[PDB]
Structure 1
Amino acid sequence: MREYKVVVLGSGGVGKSALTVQFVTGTFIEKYDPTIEDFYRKEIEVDSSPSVLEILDTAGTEQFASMRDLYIKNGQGFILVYSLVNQQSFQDIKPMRDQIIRVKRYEKVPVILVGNKVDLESEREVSSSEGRALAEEWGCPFMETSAKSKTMVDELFAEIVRQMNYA
């Protein structure tokens, strides 16, 4: 079975857990402790070929540099999530990506940048153009999501599979 190990990263409260649980269960959650780590296995077809994803949902809030290193070493593809209604979470995702490239120095690293919470667009603090500009500097896909939408979340997880195969 081709298995892909995906790790979801980003500051506390951006929606890592809500995106993952939308993907797994098709439902949107209202809150969940930031100190929990959870693994999920889930089959997906991407471009009509069945794949198995193991997704690691991280306790991401200010966690110690060596603990982010451990997650990076053992993941194969990374979803980097910020909240478009929280510009500090956008500033925070830059160091996270650069740490991945350094830690994984002998590899091309499949990554996607996600600006989440697009359903709250009247509280938007980060423009689409600013996220797109950063993803263009990183040479990776960019998407704005809401964890309320199962189609957006399915498209996200399909595209990380495609990135992991192209690398």
Structure 2
Amino acid sequence: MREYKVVVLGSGGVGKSALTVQFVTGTFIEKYDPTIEDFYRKEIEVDSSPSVLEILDTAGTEQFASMRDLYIKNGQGFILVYSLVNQQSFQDIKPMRDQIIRVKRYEKVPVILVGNKVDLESEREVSSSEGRALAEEWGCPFMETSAKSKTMVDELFAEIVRQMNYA
């Protein structure tokens, strides 16, 4: 019920592009192509409401550090992704919300914390309760996902819309 600008942030290879491409195409990318800066748009029915999601999928590998503030300035909603099989990506996510609040200057920014790659949880490095405790401290929702399933990815994107709708 408006245009929704979501920025997906997180370190290299956590599955930011696989999550966005699952949402947009219903396909799973199996190869790893490091992202420069990709924009997607899709219509979605969130609780029957028409919502045009515009998704900025950013670079994680070496990111584009200085520019991240520009991405944050322009974003309305933020999906903070880590890989649950990579402890370091989780650690890398911990300053991200503070950086968002710094750029935006207000505390109630719509964010979701995502632990991705749940289908690889035989090699889990970060437990649900850890992710969930970070999200609780931030006051935002926590989800765990696999970019392999359309269903999990659709609820992710549906939820960020609800968070942006209620701010």
User: CA 1:64 to 1:91, structure 2 compared with 1: closer, same or farther past 3 Å?
Assistant: same
Counterpart position of 1:65: 65
Q: 1:61 deviation in Å? A: 2.0
* Distance in 2, Cα, partners of 1:64 & 1:9: 11
Question: What SS does structure 1 have at the residue aligned with 2:113?
Answer: strand
Please identify runs of 4+ aligned residues in structure 1 that moved more than 3 A: none
Q: What whole-Å deviation, never above 9, does each CA across 1:83-142 have from its counterpart, x for those lacking one?
A: 000000000001112100111104621000000000001000000000000000000000
Q: Which runs of 5+ in 2 are unaligned?
A: none
Larger deviation: 30-39 or 157-166? 30-39
- If the length of structure 1 is used for normalisation, what is the TM-score? 0.96
User: CA 1:64 to 1:40, structure 2 compared with 1: closer, same or farther past 3 Å?
Assistant: closer
Q: What whole-Å deviation, never above 9, does each CA across 1:39-95 have from its counterpart, x for those lacking one?
A: 011000000111100000101223343211010000000000000000000000011
For the 8 Å contact 2:20–2:57, the answer to whether it is kept is: yes
* Distance in 1, Cα, partners of 2:136 & 2:41: 30
Counterpart position of 2:100: 100
Identity of aligned residues (%): 100
Aligned length: 167
For the 8 Å contact 2:17–2:35, the answer to whether it is kept is: no
Q: 1:36 deviation in Å? A: 1.8
Counterpart position of 1:13: 13
* Distance in 2, Cα, partners of 1:60 & 1:67: 12
For the aligned residue pairs, the C-alpha RMSD in angstroms reads 1.2
- If the length of structure 2 is used for normalisation, what is the TM-score? 0.96
Question: What SS does structure 1 have at the residue aligned with 2:43?
Answer: strand
